Amino acid sequence: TSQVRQNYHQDSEAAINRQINLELYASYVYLSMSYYFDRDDVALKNFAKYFLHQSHEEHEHAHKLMKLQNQRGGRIFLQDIKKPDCDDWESGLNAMECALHLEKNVNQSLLELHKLATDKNDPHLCDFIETHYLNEQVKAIKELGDHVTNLRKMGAPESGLAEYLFDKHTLG
Amino acid sequence: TSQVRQNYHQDSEAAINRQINLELYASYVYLSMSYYFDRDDVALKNFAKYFLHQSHEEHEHAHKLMKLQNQRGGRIFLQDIKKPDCDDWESGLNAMECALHLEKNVNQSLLELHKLATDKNDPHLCDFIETHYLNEQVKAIKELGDHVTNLRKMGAPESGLAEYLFDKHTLG
Amino acid sequence: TSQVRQNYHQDSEAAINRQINLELYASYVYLSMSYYFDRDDVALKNFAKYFLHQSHEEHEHAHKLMKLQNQRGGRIFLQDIKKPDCDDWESGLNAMECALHLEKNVNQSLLELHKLATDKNDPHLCDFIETHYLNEQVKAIKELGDHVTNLRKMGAPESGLAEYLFDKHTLG
Amino acid sequence: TSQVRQNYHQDSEAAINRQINLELYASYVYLSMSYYFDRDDVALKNFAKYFLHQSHEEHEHAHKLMKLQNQRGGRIFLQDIKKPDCDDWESGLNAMECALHLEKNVNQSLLELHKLATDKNDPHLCDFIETHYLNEQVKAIKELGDHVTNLRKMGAPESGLAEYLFDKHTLG
Amino acid sequence: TSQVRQNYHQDSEAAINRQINLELYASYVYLSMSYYFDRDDVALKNFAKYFLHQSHEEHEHAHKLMKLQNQRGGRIFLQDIKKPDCDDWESGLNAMECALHLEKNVNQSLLELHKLATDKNDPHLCDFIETHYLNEQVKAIKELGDHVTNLRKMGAPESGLAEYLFDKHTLG
Amino acid sequence: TSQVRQNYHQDSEAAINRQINLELYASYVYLSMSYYFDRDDVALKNFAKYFLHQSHEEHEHAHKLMKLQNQRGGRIFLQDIKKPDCDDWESGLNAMECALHLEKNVNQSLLELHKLATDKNDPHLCDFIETHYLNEQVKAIKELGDHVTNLRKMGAPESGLAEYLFDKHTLG
Ligand SMILES: [Fe+3]
Ligand SMILES: [Fe+3]
Ligand SMILES: [Fe+3]
Ligand SMILES: [Fe+3]
Ligand SMILES: [Fe+3]
Ligand SMILES: [Fe+3]
Ligand SMILES: [Fe+3]
Ligand SMILES: [Fe+3]
Ligand SMILES: [Fe+3]
Ligand SMILES: [Fe+3]
Ligand SMILES: [Fe+3]
Ligand SMILES: [Fe+3]
């Protein structure tokens, strides 16, 4: 056992590894979206920039989880990062909706992780989750919901002008 | 009687208290509007910012009236601040129209207050109203009328693109 | 249901609305106190400044709660803001004691809110309360207790010199 | 009872006093270590500096706990600060291992304190512990584990060159 | 077909997609190494920093390849990013040797890509590879060879002092 | 024997260890006083600040004595730091009188130490005491005497206004 390990349950360690994989997968999905909007037949540059920034943030989250795993004496076990569900995201609105769904899935995973940590009486893990992930997820979900609402009201995806103007004014 | 009270009629004091309550109520209505536009299913951030600023200004007006009440030797009697008429303001255009109606109501109350002060031969109160409230109300009414006209001409509330672009370009 | 709503119980939403009303009421009470000390027959300017700052802070707390309600997909339902219990607060010491009682009531409401959020397994709400409200309430209660102790030891409210010197040296 | 006391159990107060004594004892142990490495027959100046800084930090932790005790209306009851277990710490590696053991003991005490606060439904105390002590303890334990690992791999304590170079390069 | 596609063979597009996957896999391997050296029982911080920087650079290479794919009218097809071959890299020297092997594999893949582009008479692709990847790979291979040589000469991996001093002086 | 030891008698070493314990005890007493005045039912913040500064200075004195012990080749032997005589110091005036008594006790111990060093013909120890401790003690005793005189003349401890004004004007 690790010399620094204290009040760190094996189930918590396994759940942390699963969360690391999930964050990496989310980063990969965002990368796919970003370079979808970089295509010459899509050409929505600020959508691409937004999703690239999201990918970078997801990577940062994964990094922080790995650092936590090392801090508590757990051992990182990396797994395959599955490819995203789609290659063609079909519109800015569809990409935003998919991102909202992904963020809610990540939030649900984090909530299950917090429940596990509470059941295992690991207050440090609970505080780590609350401080670094829960509010970030809530803010991200709210922002994506706002984006989806605005895109729908402007007339997307049928109205290409709507997505162009949202690209310029909101994401620009 | 207050040692500083001079040429301050009881009717003027009561009307000032009523005006204080009205200004607080207007601030509360603007707060309700602002956080209506902060909703994820509305998501018009500059509308929310505009109405929050209006709420802040109404609060300042109430504060100034209370300071006047103390200056003249009157006694402040606070009353319940009634909740706004609506929880859902249904659109940017509807909110702007409601704000215009509210500002005209406040202006009418201020005009009645000025008439009372003139009838009571209280030139300090008349000058206070004219200097601090009447022109501010006229400017606010003109601005809200301009906003309503522009929103109607752009196609609001049916055209969501109209409200989005007004949010960005005029209120932004 | 709101597209952003996740792990947000209806009971939590209702309790948040009640807390919003309570914070607004506390701001209104502090406003009443502040302008009581602005009276010509009281004339304790730093007491007025202190209570005005407290009113502003309570308003900020209410605003933050409304923002949280929107973030989680809940719906804000505003209610009447009841007028404060007293128009005449009768002394600096009495006002400080009333403020201490009010802050302890708000703290108890926040503790009940935290208990509800814990029972509903809403870690984001629990963390929000702990991060933004609990320590602020503890600090405010401690500060008001210190003020009350100092005023009592100096001889307030019978000794007007005590309240004058406390106004100058502590609140100044 | 204290006028500011609210939702503060007597058991929590007693546990806080015990934790204050433990933090003071840890500071005293670190002081002993630091001045052990200041000896002419040991002469590892950066080891002494490191342990002096640790003693200072432990003192800060004790101070923060006493401030918390006063904030919540509890009463501080100081006890004797027992002398450290050893006068001669025998090596840099042995001192680091003893510091790791001490930090893990302090962490276990803090975890028991958090469990008690959770059982007593004192969310402010739980948040205080999580925000100010748990992550600091985890980081300290990880750092001491890293130091112990590096010292062991370099050949300490038999290799004096190892401790000299660790003194210069890591602690310097 | 893409409106911007010109002199871009399908085989080149497929090879570019394979290279993108390879660069992502290399970044993932470097990430695994970096957090291996962050472990409390390894504790070689500059090794971790070095491999984290390498992971970041590999990610940048992948990004540049995806940008090229979009520029030429090709379509990005992402695949699973396989997990690294090892979880425990067993030493700084072993990690450096594995990194050298990985970089030589990437270089061989790039050379095959250049051969394919030359066979397909795609001078833009050839120039892209030469300008952005070939010299970077040569420099990386030379640097890793230097690191391996120095670690072997210092006595690694048996001599822990060797790896500590290399961590401090070369990677620091 | 230590390689640096020269003209350092064992009795001097023992007396230095006793003085180290006494300085630590004085720091602990001052800490107790400081946090007594931080209580919500005492609330004399500048008294608390003054006694905290005194505790810090006593700690510095202890540190300097330990450094001297190491410089001369003596060996530091730490003992238990006894808890202060009182938990409740009952007033600012009583705390000041107790501090005066404590400082005079420390001064008497230092004078006995100087007498011992003179009897042992250790001029370095005598000069150390004279340069670093004797004048500091005289100044501290004079300052505490001035504080006690002023508090008594102002009407403390019966007059709470006296202690409040002394807190503000002298200790502020
Ligand atoms: Fe990325
Ligand atoms: Fe994430
Ligand atoms: Fe407002
Ligand atoms: Fe107004
Ligand atoms: Fe206010
Ligand atoms: Fe509040
Ligand atoms: Fe210290
Ligand atoms: Fe500590
Ligand atoms: Fe990376
Ligand atoms: Fe590469
Ligand atoms: Fe101290
Ligand atoms: Fe001293």
Residue numbers in the entry:
A (entry chain V), B (entry chain C), C (entry chain L), D (entry chain D), E (entry chain A), F (entry chain N): 5 to 176
Sentences from the paper on this structure:
As an iron storage and release self-assembling protein cage, wild-type Ftn (wt-Ftn) comprises 24 FTH1 subunits with 12 C2 axes20. With the ultimate objective to create a biocatalysis platform that could be expressed in vivo, we report the rational design of an artificial human ferritin heavy chain (FTH1)-based metalloprotein to achieve histidine-specific aza-Michael addition with α,β-unsaturated chemical moieties. Utilizing the large area the C2 interfaces cover altogether, mutated FTH1 subunits were designed to assemble only upon divalent copper binding at the C2 interfaces hosting their histidine mutations. To still allow these sites and/or structurally induced nearby residues to chelate Cu(II) for catalyzing histidine modifications while allowing the ferritin cage to reserve its self-assembling property, instead of modifying all of the above-mentioned four copper-chelating histidines, we attempted to replace only one (R63) or two (R63/E67), which are noncopper-chelating, with histidine analogs 1–3 (4-thiazolyl-l-alanine, 1; 2-(5-bromothienyl)-l-alanine (BtA), 2; 3-methyl-l-histidine (MeH), 3), separately, via genetic code expansion.
The cryo-EM structural models of Ftn-2X-2 and Ftn-2x-3 and these two Ftns with CuCl2 supplement were solved and revealed two detailed metal binding environments. In fully Fe(II)-bonded Ftn-2x-3, S59/H60/63MeH at the C2 interface and E27/E62/H65 binding sites are identified. In a comparison to the ICP-MS data and structural models of Ftn-1x-3 and Ftn-2x-3, the E67MeH mutation displays dual roles in aromatic ring stacking and metal chelating in controlling Fe(II) and Cu(II) binding.
